[PDB]
Amino acid sequence: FIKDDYGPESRGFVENSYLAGLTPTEFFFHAMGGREGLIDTAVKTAETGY
Amino acid sequence: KNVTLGVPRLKELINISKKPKTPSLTVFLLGQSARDAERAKDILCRLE
Amino acid sequence: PGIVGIRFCQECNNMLYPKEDKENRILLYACRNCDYQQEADNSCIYVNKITHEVDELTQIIADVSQDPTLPRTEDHPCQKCGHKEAVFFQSHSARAEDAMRLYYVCTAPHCGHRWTE
DNA sequence: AGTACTAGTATGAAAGTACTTGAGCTTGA
DNA sequence: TCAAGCTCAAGTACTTAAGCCTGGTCTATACTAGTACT
Ligand SMILES: [Zn+2]
Ligand SMILES: [Zn+2]
C-alpha cells in the first residue's frame, strides 16, 4: 500500500467472504484480528482463576 | 466515553484500588439547565 | 513576534545571557565566564508558542519527491513551473494537533516547490 | 626423592500497597 | 524568634501472579591431598 492510505482496503476491511476466499492481504489482516482472539483466551483464564 | 469493563474492571471493585484506570462521575441537572443545552453547557464550563 | 534564538560570545564562544543595564535601561547580553557584553538588538528574550500553530512547509524536505511509496496526482499542477506531477502526503508529524491536510511537493528535478491546499 | 595422576571433598516488555523517614509548618515558650 | 512536635508526602521494599494431566533428558567442577611409579 501507498503511504497515508486510509481507504477501506488498506486499513483492514475484508470485502471477500470465506467462500469466495480472502485475497492475500485480507488473509494477513484476518490473521491479525484472530491473533487478538487467541491471546485474550490465553491471558484471561489465568486472571479469572486468581 | 471509553470505560473499563469485564475482568479488568472486576479487579478494581474487588481489590478496592485507590486509583481506577477510568474513574467517572455522572452528573444530573435540576432546573431548566436540564432541558436546555445552552443552560447546560454553562454548568458544563463550571465543572471542567 | 518571532521564535527568537541563541547568541554566542565571541571570545570563549559560550552562551550569552540576557541581563538588564540598570543605568541606561538597555537590555544586554553577557557571557558569565568573561566580561564580554553586547547590546540587545531584538529586545525580546523568551518566547513560547503554546497554541503552536506550526508551519509544516518549513519542515518539509524537497527530496521527498523521490519516494516511490508516496502517492501522486496530476490533478494539481505546480504553482511555480506548472508541472503536473505532485506527490502529496499528510503531516507525518506527532503532536500535529488534528491535521489531515495534504502537503504537496512538486516532482520533476530541482523544482521542489511545496504548497498546501 | 620428586613429579604426576587420581580420587575425594568442599562450595526491555510487574504492579500495587504499606510502612518508614524526612521535611515543612504551626504553636508554645 | 527559636525549637519541638506532628502531619503529610515521597520513596523504597516486599508479596503474589490457573486448574488438572502426559511425555522426555539430565544431574558439578575445581582444588587439594595422598599414593604410586619412575
Ligand atoms: Zn564569553
Ligand atoms: Zn514545479
Swiss-Prot record, chain A:
Name of the protein in its database record: DNA-directed RNA polymerase II subunit RPB1
Protein family according to the UniProt entry: Belongs to the RNA polymerase beta' chain family.
Comment, domains: The C-terminal domain (CTD) serves as a platform for assembly of factors that regulate transcription initiation, elongation, termination and mRNA processing.
Gene: POLR2A
Superkingdom classification of source: Eukaryota
Subcellular location: Nucleus; Cytoplasm; Chromosome
Annotated signal peptide: none
Region span, Bridging helix: 23-50
UniProtKB/Swiss-Prot annotation, chain C:
Alphabetized PANTHER family for the sequence: DNA-DIRECTED RNA POLYMERASE (PTHR11239), DNA-DIRECTED RNA POLYMERASE II SUBUNIT RPB9 (PTHR11239:SF1)
Function (record text): DNA-dependent RNA polymerase catalyzes the transcription of DNA into RNA using the four ribonucleoside triphosphates as substrates. Component of RNA polymerase II which synthesizes mRNA precursors and many functional non-coding RNAs. Pol II is the central component of the basal RNA polymerase II transcription machinery. It is composed of mobile elements that move relative to each other. RPB9 is part of the upper jaw surrounding the central large cleft and thought to grab the incoming DNA template.
Binding of Zn(2+) 1, residues: C9, C12, C31, C34
InterPro entries on file: DNA-dir_RNA_pol-M_15_CS, Rpa12/Rpb9/Rpc10/TFS, Zn_ribbon_RPB9, Zn_ribbon_RPB9_C, Znf_TFIIS
Zn finger residue spans: C4-type: 9-34
SUPFAM superfamilies to which the protein is assigned, alphabetical: Zinc beta-ribbon (SSF57783)
Predominant localisation class: nucleus
Zn finger spans (TFIIS-type): 74-116
CDD domains xref list: Zn-ribbon_RPB9
Biological process annotations from GO: maintenance of transcriptional fidelity during transcription elongation by RNA polymerase II; transcription by RNA polymerase II; transcription initiation at RNA polymerase II promoter; transcription-coupled nucleotide-excision repair
Keyword Transcription: yes
Name recorded for this polypeptide: DNA-directed RNA polymerase II subunit RPB9
Protein keywords: Acetylation, DNA-directed RNA polymerase, Metal-binding, Nucleus, Transcription, Zinc, Zinc-finger
Cellular compartment(s): Nucleus, Nucleolus
